[PDB]
Design a protein around this ligand. Sequence first.
Ligand code: HEM
Ligand code: E8T
Ligand code: NA
Length: 390
Amino acid sequence: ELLTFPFASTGLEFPPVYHELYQQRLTKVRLPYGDDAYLAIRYADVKTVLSDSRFSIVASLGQDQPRTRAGARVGNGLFSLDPPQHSRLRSVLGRDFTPRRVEKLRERVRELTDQCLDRMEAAGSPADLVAHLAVPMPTAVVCEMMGVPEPDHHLFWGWAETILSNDTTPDDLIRRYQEFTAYMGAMVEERRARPTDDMFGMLVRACDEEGRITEIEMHALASDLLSAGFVSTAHQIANFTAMLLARPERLQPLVDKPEQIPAAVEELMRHVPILSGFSFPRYATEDLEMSGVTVRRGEAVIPVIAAANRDPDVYPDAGRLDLERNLPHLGFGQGPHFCIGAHLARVELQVVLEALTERFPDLRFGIPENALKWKRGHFMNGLHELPVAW
Ligand code: HEM
Ligand SMILES: CC[C@@H]1C[C@@H]2C[C@@H]3[C@H]4C/C=C\C(=O)NCCC[C@@H]5NC(=O)/C(=C(O)/C=C/[C@@H]4C[C@H](O)[C@H]3[C@@H]2[C@H]1C)C5=O
Ligand code: NA
């Protein structure tokens, strides 16, 4: 009988069972759904799973995907493909997410952040940082990039939640798909009649004018970006703020030394266990060795990125949040599926800390920290609410 995964923990806890496993051979676990899998936890092994071509993201051998969600994760977008099919589809978005394009969005990201903090301050201390900033700012940023109007934001929140809830069924997923495809269908029509200079329009051109992708792939790319592109940073904005506010000096190191904000963001990315479960398993495509075990063809290995980011040999005193630490974390993944949004996410999180430190240097929890309400059945770790006071 096998060890169950994911492991017990609450909030942003990193549980001690990892300290035991780092010292042992690769371990097989049973998951909430699908087949058993091995647990890659060493930094080098997680990197291997995510970037070696002997690890496929596609269950091409009849596997039942190891997962935390009742309905298997399947579709026609970026997580459904290996190179080189993956690489050809991504390259349609590629140019829109390089550092040279994303650095152009700093001003806008700050403008929205400032508008969020204006409404939060207007509401009065103590106020929920989740509802006033973590949710609205990242939603606006990607919805404006794509071309979705503010009145429609709530629809994408709903669709993204269904993907990210562990009690979602195949039927729940069929409903999301029908709702979403209808909505994108309207957007595709609108832009065929009236083209626009946004990301929907870019995909509509790539489908219709240059024949680079098909309609199903244009829909899939849109779906991936609007599913991944804002619930992510939302959770992280509140997780990062909560980590800072739980330390005795709170925001003061970054008030005093604003230039260290990019480094803090990186350390927080390394430290925060953002996933409550785990991402896509990969499947070995030939027999290979990993941490003393022969992984046979077809068997699954889960890349545990939170465990990689606390590898005891890569990161001395890995549990310590040291905003000045300086090896590259796996918090945006690695290899082919490394986060297309990574630079946008860095920009959003940097800007948020700039805004928070410049405007509320004495930010503090607005409730006792033991009263913090951490989410329970979500794909990600985070707060239902984050009351802050100034
Ligand atoms: C703090 C915020 C974020 C974190 C921690 C994060 C983390 C990750 C990680 C670890 C993966 C790889 C998962 C795997 O290989 O199994 C990934 C993939 C992806 N992320 Fe991000 N991400 C964030 C924000 C964003 C944003 C802002 C976008 C906006 C477009 C985005 C879009 C995507 C997409 C489309 C993929 C799939 C890439 C591919 O398969 O080619 N993410 N993210
Ligand atoms: C902040 C953490 C980041 C946020 C990112 C959002 C990512 C999740 C969402 C990413 C894409 C998406 O939802 N695209 C549309 C559906 C297509 C297809 N069908 C599914 O049922 C499915 C998933 O169900 C994916 C779950 C991802 C799993 C992945 O692990 C998450 C990333 C996660 C590691 C599919 O991909
Ligand atoms: Na820095």
